[PDB]
């Protein structure tokens, strides 16, 4: 078990390398085919039947998310037959390209693909592995880019933040609260992509870091919202300020660095005179903070820490590269004169 | 030609309401491997007549992963029936 | 470890013989010079048609007569 | 399709109120068809005459509001002074919303029906007037 | 034995999918696939390629279908039934079955029906379109699978098959 | 496009059977060598076998006299030689090994020819300059023109990154 | 054109005889077991990687050989390493 | 943009460089000075001016990274401006030579109150 | 995104199983082999944004090589040029 637990973990990133390093439609077929075969035993380890009744819902979704891709691949074999990763030379194929590929980056359609998976998994350790599946198909879209029907890609993005802004008003499961708002940032970096595909990854990098800090701060004891009442006066009061340092940043306020892509997202989006569409998104992003307020009101205000059981013992977790993470996640908004020069 | 039109309707046995529904859940996974050979042949039409001679490995290496993907999800339905005895996709407890 | 080959060959004498055929099979293609005769023949099998070329001045070698000593010598095999 | 909207802004211009709303009820007649599709698949299994969905009559609401959506224009765009103006096209928003106020009764739902539906109507002819584009390109 | 012998198998191959498209009490679903893929193997055996289709008997029709047929006995231990002997099965079997001949009914049976539904004429020998003759090397299609230039595929695909065993060496 | 007439057709095709055509098959091309390799350049180097129709008759004409030559002088051990290989099955060249010497005793003797053991069907040659080489090939319409580049001089930023306020 | 007229006699002969066998000359007027499942899955794994092993005799009349030599031996390695980890647990088989 | 898969090419030798003692290189690591204090503050140090080896090498991390990061950043605007000027220099019809007129021609609106 | 490791370090992952005319292990061409060799020559230094507006021609006959579309449209209407006059004579040609 502990030898191959690295080996299974090793081949996941081996999959997404082959997605990035190829000029061939059949290798990128294989690429996130073997990824979908490498995620399954991570879901299992304690062999609980709820984990099995979550992975199989995860399974046959991504099976079709594989198998629909190849149906697009044989069309531009019948249409000019070249296999370089380029324009698809058929709008009937590019339609079949994107809205199959959008399953693995789950949009406003394919609703319960995200929450029903992430809720019900006992492994709340991670399950940060669902950032890799946010990383691999974005590394195809940078190359599909100059042949899209241009209306389908923006329609899924306007709907993306519309449902994600609504989902967590009806929630206590902080996994589902973090399952939602993963639709939110995946609407923005699609909505840039017709206008300068560079600086899309700027939204991608900031989203990785502010989700990496979130579950590592959730790996103290908390899995339920009212369980985040009983740690300030029980586990550690130092965690209570630090969790307020991130939930307010990821809402996007300008003195923190969570606002930083949405600062730059308009400088690109206008100057190409699309005005009514960024205004509808930024006003929707107001609702992205009322998840966090009404959640930060619970942990930072000492809301009745009952159940007398005092932790006089020390803590030994594995906070691996943890304390160096919210130093570019708060105070980096002055520290990006050109993030669009090293990445772009 | 008409040999491309059929088979192209034969690809539309991947009807999604008959791909995860209803119960006797093996009938769902049935047409998944049944969605294979609608792509093994349809590729092998155009590769063969237009004498490519190099992409012959492509439908062969297709069927390598086609059973290998089909090998995985069949195992989990045993693990469904390990604690239950029947598949019955109307089984639902873990909600969203 | 010297009796380790004599306390398993008197214990499980099946896979012991397999590893000896796992051996003596990887090593020997890099040893005897009967190989690279395998390469000289497998390249000198004519499938397609040898199309001639156009002369312009030179003529470095090989005039039009096929039975002239103008090309290589693969006729060692018939003498072999 | 975009052939319907291409047949909308070109010919009538307030006039020809016989075929104005005949081109304008089709969008309203097609709009309830989309929500009827989810009302049988997301809402649970209905009676033995599917589609037999939960409240029903969604097309019966949608085709009526889309009928009066062009009708209140081509009457008022004919009778006041004969342009299409933001003040002129404002009037179609209020009473067209109150079918959703008449059905599913008022004082909490129909009271906002004239409220929100009118302001979003007047921006449309304002939108084509100043040269605005939603989906532009360089 | 006529000229239309290739196309007439393809239409039969369409209907093998419809035989299990609803719910054929899934033991006959195996008998929906063997009838299909064998005819599907017949379609590949035209056009030059002999070897590449016959393996689908071994690797899939002898390979996947047996293990497929090895299930639905170790699970689903209820009482099965012959399909079409109910009203839950035949409720849609005829619906796409009419269109399968209706698609053929006017693609070319009229003179010009019409513009985009009459582009492909039925027959007659342009379905093959394989002249002129070839070589004595192979089919070819005979020198088709090579451990020349494609080697990066084999090291990846073989190593993917290895870790497939380990995931099934565990939980089950 | 255009096609040549029904004339320059109906020339004397060698109406022989396939076994008697593969009977000799070895002394045939090993001594003619003038129109055939020129016809190969006429087909391989230059495509469109419609400017290339003439020498297909020339190599055909040489084979006409060729079987007429072997018929007049030594044909009795030839006629028995394709007799045994007519007894069919894969047309092996070791079943009729015995009768080969009775044919081949006089091909080097009566009319005096060669036994091309292994030197034939190899060793790519050159032939002769006969016709103009088809430069400016089949269409070769244009390249067309590329787009110009910049060489310049790598200076740093004019005032530095010029983004919103961002002095340096 | 008899392939296809070659087996049609063979299959019409079998279905004929049953009618003289089962028909007209008669006229009378599951528990699950895990150890019996994992061998079928194990077989199909070694059933795939012999089909990739399959194109060998055409892969000898070829170009430079040590590419085809050292790589074809590698599939047997992956077929054999797969045994050894599975050899650590076979069950009552 | 040619010669890909490079962190920074060998065409980047004409850089001043973006040297030390800028406030950014001061700032890159200034947060790292605050960062290592938090690493004490998580695991109940409780010192907050702790052992120097944990109090250091957060400083050594960002400072070498930040200087090695700024080298391509000034290069990237430079190569962005390196391409722009020639296309400005070419196509004179795409860059009109406008005539400047003084404030004797302009008759603006004119709107007083 | 496309990091292109194979450009700096000079090995090919594949790069050979890419187009219709690259390797052909015993020099056996394809049916539309003659138009690949022309269509690549058109837009090589072109940055693909004017290629859909500059070359525009060698892509067309190449695309119609792969289908023989209007050739099949031209040949089918011969069955309406003749073959509606079946009983109206015009055997044309007599055998052989
Ligand atoms: C041997 C290959 C190893 C590949 C390892 C890949 C690890 C997975 C990476 C996933 C996250 C990707 C983040 C993108 C930004 C990474 C930093 C970077 O810009 O390096 C790319 C750099 C800069 O790229 P570049 O300037 O050479 O050209 C590529 C341009 N982009 C990145 C836009 C596609 O690439 C390198 O040359 C490495 C140094
Ligand atoms: C002297 C430092 C304070 C006294 C020692 C620290 C003891 C401690 O652990 O308190 C942590 C405290 C967090 O507050 P809280 O968790 O709510 O309550 C716990 C009180 N024991 O408060 C904290 O110290 C949290 C750390 C704040 C963020 C790091 C700042 C470090 C400050 C020390 C360096 C001073 C210079 C930094 C400011 C520079 C400004 C230019």
UniProtKB/Swiss-Prot annotation, chain B:
Places the protein is found: Mitochondrion inner membrane
GO biological process entries: ATP synthesis coupled electron transport
Record membrane topology: Multi-pass membrane protein
Gene3D superfamilies: 1.10.287.3510
Major place of residence: mitochondrion
Keyword NAD in record: yes
E.C. no: 7.1.1.2
Chemical reaction(s) catalysed: a ubiquinone + NADH + 5 H(+)(in) = a ubiquinol + NAD(+) + 4 H(+)(out)
A GO CC term assigned to this protein in UniProt: respiratory chain complex I
Segments crossing the lipid bilayer: 1-20, 28-48, 60-80
Family per similarity comment: Belongs to the complex I subunit 4L family.
Function: Core subunit of the mitochondrial membrane respiratory chain NADH dehydrogenase (Complex I) which catalyzes electron transfer from NADH through the respiratory chain, using ubiquinone as an electron acceptor. Part of the enzyme membrane arm which is embedded in the lipid bilayer and involved in proton translocation.
Name this polypeptide is given: NADH-ubiquinone oxidoreductase chain 4L
Species: Bos taurus (Bovine)
Encoding gene per record: MT-ND4L
From Swiss-Prot, chain C:
Principal location listed in the UniProt entry: mitochondrion
Compartment list: Mitochondrion inner membrane
Coiled-coil annotated spans: none
Gene Ontology CC, one term: mitochondrial inner membrane
Membrane topology: Single-pass membrane protein
Keywords attached to this entry: Acetylation, Electron transport, Membrane, Mitochondrion, Mitochondrion inner membrane, Respiratory chain, Transmembrane, Transmembrane helix, Transport
Region Disordered: start-end pairs: 52-80
Any Pfam family the entry gives: NADHdh_A3
Entry's transmembrane regions: 14-34
InterPro entries xrefs: NDUFA3
Assigned protein family: Belongs to the complex I NDUFA3 subunit family.
Protein task: Accessory subunit of the mitochondrial membrane respiratory chain NADH dehydrogenase (Complex I), that is believed not to be involved in catalysis. Complex I functions in the transfer of electrons from NADH to the respiratory chain. The immediate electron acceptor for the enzyme is believed to be ubiquinone.
Subunit structure: Complex I is composed of 45 different subunits.
Protein name, UniProt field: NADH dehydrogenase [ubiquinone] 1 alpha subcomplex subunit 3
Native source organism of the sequence: Bos taurus
Gene: NDUFA3
UniProtKB/Swiss-Prot annotation, chain F:
Disulfides per UniProt: 32-62, 42-52, 74-106, 84-96
Motif mapping: Cx9C motif 3: 74-84
Free-text comment about domains: Contains four C-X9-C motifs that are predicted to form a helix-coil-helix structure, permitting the formation of intramolecular disulfide bonds.
Subunit record text: Complex I is composed of 45 different subunits.
Intervals of motif Cx9C motif 4: 96-106
Pfam families with a match to the protein in the record: CHCH
Protein name: NADH dehydrogenase [ubiquinone] 1 alpha subcomplex subunit 8
Database matches in InterPro entries: CHCH (IPR010625), NDUFA8 (IPR016680)
Lineage, top ranks: Eukaryota, Metazoa, Chordata, Craniata, Vertebrata
GO biological process, one term: mitochondrial electron transport, NADH to ubiquinone
Function: Accessory subunit of the mitochondrial membrane respiratory chain NADH dehydrogenase (Complex I), that is believed not to be involved in catalysis. Complex I functions in the transfer of electrons from NADH to the respiratory chain. The immediate electron acceptor for the enzyme is believed to be ubiquinone.
PANTHER family according to UniProt: NADH DEHYDROGENASE [UBIQUINONE] 1 ALPHA SUBCOMPLEX SUBUNIT 8, NADH-UBIQUINONE OXIDOREDUCTASE
Ranges spanned by the short sequence motif Cx9C motif 2, renumbered to the chain: 52-62
Compartments (UniProt record): Mitochondrion inner membrane; Mitochondrion intermembrane space; Mitochondrion
Recorded topology in the membrane: Peripheral membrane protein
Coiled coil (residue ranges): none
Family: Belongs to the complex I NDUFA8 subunit family.
Chain intervals with Basic and acidic residues compositional bias: 142-155
Source organism: Bos taurus
Domain named CHCH: residues: 29-70, 71-114
Highest taxon of source: Eukaryota
Motif Cx9C motif 1 in this chain: 32-42
Region annotation (Disordered) ranges: 129-155
UniProtKB/Swiss-Prot annotation, chain I:
Motif, Cx9C motif 1: chain positions: 32-42
Membrane topology: Peripheral membrane protein
InterPro entries: NADH_UbQ_OxRdtase_FeS-su5
Renumbered ranges of motif Cx9C motif 2: 55-65
Highest rank taxon of the organism: Eukaryota
GO cellular component: mitochondrial inner membrane; mitochondrial intermembrane space; mitochondrion; respiratory chain complex I
CHCH domain ranges (all copies): 29-73
Record keywords: Disulfide bond, Electron transport, Membrane, Mitochondrion, Mitochondrion inner membrane, Respiratory chain, Transport
Pfam families recorded: Ndufs5
Region (Disordered): 83-96
GO biological process terms on file: mitochondrial respiratory chain complex I assembly
Main location: mitochondrion
Functional description taken from the UniProt entry: Accessory subunit of the mitochondrial membrane respiratory chain NADH dehydrogenase (Complex I), that is believed not to be involved in catalysis. Complex I functions in the transfer of electrons from NADH to the respiratory chain. The immediate electron acceptor for the enzyme is believed to be ubiquinone.
Sequence similarity: Belongs to the complex I NDUFS5 subunit family.
UniProt name for this protein: NADH dehydrogenase [ubiquinone] iron-sulfur protein 5
Organism: Bos taurus (Bovine)
């Amino acid at each position: 078990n502990p030898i191959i637990f690295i080996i299974i973990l090793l081949t996941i990133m081996l999959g997404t390398i082959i997605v990035m390093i190829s000029s061939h439609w059949l290798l990128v077929w294989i690429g996130f085919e073997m990824n979908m075969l490498a995620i399954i035993p991570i879901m299992m380890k304690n062999h609980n039947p709820r984990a099995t009744e979550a992975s199989t819902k995860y399974f046959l979704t991504q099976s079709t998310a594989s198998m629909l891709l190849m149906m697009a691949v044989i069309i531009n074999l019948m249409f000019s037959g070249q296999w370089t990763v380029m324009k698809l030379f058929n709008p009937m194929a590019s339609m079949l390209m994107t809205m199959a590929l959008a399953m693995k980056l789950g949009m406003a359609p394919f609703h319960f693909w995200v929450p029903e998976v992430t809720q019900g998994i006992p492994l709340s350790s991670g399950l940060i592995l669902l950032t890799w599946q946010k990383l691999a198909p974005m590394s195809v879209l940078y190359q599909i880019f100059p042949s899209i029907n241009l209306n389908l890609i923006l329609t899924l993005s306007v709907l993306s933040i519309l449902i994600g802004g609504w989902g967590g008003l009806n929630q206590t499961q902080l996994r589902k609260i973090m399952a939602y708002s993963s639709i939110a940032h995946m609407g923005w970096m699609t909505a840039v992509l017709p206008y300068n595909p560079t600086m899309t990854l700027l939204n991608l990098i900031i989203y990785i870091i502010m989700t990496s800090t979130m579950f590592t701060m959730f790996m103290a004891n908390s899995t339920t919202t009212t369980l985040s009442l009983s740690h300030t006066w029980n586990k550690t009061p130092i965690m209570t300020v630090l969790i307020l340092a991130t939930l307010l940043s990821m809402g996007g306020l300008p003195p923190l660095s969570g606002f930083m892509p949405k600062w730059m997202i308009i400088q690109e989006m206008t100057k190409n005179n699309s005005i009514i569409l960024p205004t509808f998104m930024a006003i929707t992003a107001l609702l992205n903070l009322y998840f966090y307020m009404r959640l930060t009101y619970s942990t930072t205000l000492t809301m009745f820490p009952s159940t007398n059981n005092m932790k006089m013992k020390w803590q030994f977790p594995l906070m691996k590269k943890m304390t160096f993470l919210p130093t570019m996640v708060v105070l980096s908004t002055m520290m990006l004169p050109l993030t669009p020069m090293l990445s772009v | 030609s008409m040999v491309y039109m059929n088979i192209m309707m034969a690809f539309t046995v991947s009807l999604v309401g008959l791909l995860m529904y209803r119960s006797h859940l093996m009938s769902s996974l049935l047409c998944l491997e049944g969605m294979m050979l609608s792509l093994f042949v349809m590729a092998a039409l155009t590769i063969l007549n237009s004498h490519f001679t190099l992409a012959s490995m492509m439908p062969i290496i297709l069927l390598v992963f086609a059973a290998c993907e089909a090998a995985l999800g069949l195992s989990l339905l045993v693990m469904v029936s390990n604690t239950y005895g029947t598949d019955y996709v109307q089984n639902l407890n873990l909600l969203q | 470890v010297a009796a380790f080959l004599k306390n398993v060959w008197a214990k499980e004498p099946v896979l012991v013989a397999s590893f000896a055929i796992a051996g003596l099979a990887v090593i020997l293609p890099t040893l005897s010079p009967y190989t690279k005769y395998s390469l000289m023949i497998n390249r000198a099998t004519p499938y397609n048609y040898p199309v001639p070329l156009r002369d312009d001045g030179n003529m470095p070698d090989v005039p039009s007569h096929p039975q002239d000593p103008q090309g290589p010598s693969l006729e060692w095999l018939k003498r072999l | 399709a975009k052939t319907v909207l291409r047949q909308y802004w070109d010919i009538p211009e307030g006039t020809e109120c016989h075929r104005k709303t005949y081109a304008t009820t089709s969008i309203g007649g097609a709009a309830g068809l989309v929500v009827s599709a989810y009302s049988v698949a997301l809402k649970t299994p209905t009676s033995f005459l599917e589609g037999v969905a939960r409240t029903g009559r969604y097309t019966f609401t949608a085709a009526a509001i889309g009928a009066i959506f062009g009708l209140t224009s081509c009457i008022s765009a004919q009778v006041r002074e004969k342009p299409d103006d933001p003040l002129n096209y404002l009037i179609g928003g209020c009473a067209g919303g109150l079918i959703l106020g008449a059905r599913t009764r008022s004082y909490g739902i129909g009271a906002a029906a004239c409220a929100y539906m009118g302001l979003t109507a007047a921006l449309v002819k304002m939108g084509q007037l100043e040269g605005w584009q939603v989906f532009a390109e360089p | 034995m006529m000229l239309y012998i290739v196309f007439i198998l393809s239409v039969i191959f369409v209907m093998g999918f419809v035989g299990f498209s609803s719910k054929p009490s899934p033991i006959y679903g195996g008998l929906g696939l063997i009838v299909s893929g064998g005819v599907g193997c017949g379609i590949v055996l035209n056009f030059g390629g002999s070897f590449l289709g016959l393996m689908v008997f071994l690797i899939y029709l002898g390979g996947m279908m047996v293990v497929f047929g090895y299930t639905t006995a170790m699970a689903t231990e209820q009482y099965p039934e012959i399909w079409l002997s109910n009203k839950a099965v035949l409720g849609a079997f005829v619906t796409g079955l009419l269109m399968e001949f209706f698609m053929v009914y006017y693609v070319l049976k009229d003179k010009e029906v019409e513009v985009v539904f009459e582009f492909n004429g039925l027959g007659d020998w342009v379905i093959y379109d394989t002249g002129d003759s070839g070589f004595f090397s192979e089919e070819a299609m005979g020198i088709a699978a090579l451990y020349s230039y494609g080697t990066w595929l084999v090291i990846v695909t073989g190593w993917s098959l290895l870790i497939g065993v380990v995931v099934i060496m565990e939980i089950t | 496009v255009e096609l040549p007439s029904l004339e320059d057709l109906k020339v004397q095709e060698v109406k022989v059977s396939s076994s008697v055509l593969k009977a000799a098959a070895h002394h045939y091309g090993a001594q003619c060598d003038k129109p055939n390799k020129e016809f190969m350049l006429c087909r391989w180097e230059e495509k469109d076998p419609r400017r290339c129709l003439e020498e297909g008759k020339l190599v055909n004409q040489c084979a006409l006299e060729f079987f007429r030559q072997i018929k007049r002088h030594c044909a009795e051990p030839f006629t028995e030689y394709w007799t045994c290989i007519d007894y069919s099955g894969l047309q092996l060249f070791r079943r009729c090994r015995k009768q080969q010497a009775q044919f081949d005793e006089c091909v080097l003797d009566k009319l005096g020819w060669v036994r091309p053991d292994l030197g034939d069907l190899s060793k790519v040659t050159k032939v002769k300059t006969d016709r103009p080489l088809p430069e400016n090939p089949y269409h070769s319409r244009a390249r067309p023109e590329p787009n110009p580049e910049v060489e310049g001089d790598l200076k740093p930023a004019r005032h530095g990154s010029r983004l919103f306020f961002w002095t340096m | 054109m008899n392939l296809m007229l070659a087996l049609l006699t063979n299959f019409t002969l079998a279905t004929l005889l049953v009618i003289i066998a089962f028909w007209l000359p008669q006229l009378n007027v599951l528990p699950f077991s895990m150890k019996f499942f994992l061998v079928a899955i194990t077989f199909l794994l070694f059933d795939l990687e012999i089909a990739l092993l399959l194109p060998l005799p055409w892969a000898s009349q070829t170009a430079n050989l040590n590419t085809m030599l050292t790589m074809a031996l590698f599939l047997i390695i992956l077929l054999a390493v797969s045994l050894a980890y599975e050899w650590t647990q076979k069950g009552l088989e | 943009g040619r010669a890909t898969f490079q962190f920074l090419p060998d065409e980047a030798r004409s850089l001043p460089p973006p040297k030390l003692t800028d406030p950014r290189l001061a700032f890159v690591g200034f947060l790292g000075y605050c960062s290592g204090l938090i690493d004490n503050a998580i695991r109940r140090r409780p010192v907050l001016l702790a052992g120097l080896h944990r109090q250091l090498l957060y400083i050594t991390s960002f400072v070498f990274v930040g200087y090695y990061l700024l080298k391509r950043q000034d290069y990237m605007y430079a190569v962005r401006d390196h391409d722009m000027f020639s296309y400005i220099k070419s196509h004179p019809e795409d860059f009109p030579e406008k005539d400047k007129k003084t404030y004797g021609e302009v008759f603006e609106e004119f709107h007083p109150v | 995104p496309f990091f292109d490791v194979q450009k700096r370090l000079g090995v090919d992952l594949d790069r050979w199983m890419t187009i219709q005319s690259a390797e052909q292990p015993h020099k056996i061409p394809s049916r539309c082999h003659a138009f690949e060799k022309e269509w690549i020559e058109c837009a090589h230094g072109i940055g693909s944004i004017r290629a859909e507006k500059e070359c525009k021609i060698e892509f067309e006959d190449f695309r119609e090589c792969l289908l023989r579309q209007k050739t099949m449209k031209r040949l089918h209407a011969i069955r309406r040029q003749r073959e509606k006059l079946i009983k109206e004579g015009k055997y044309t040609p007599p055998p052989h």
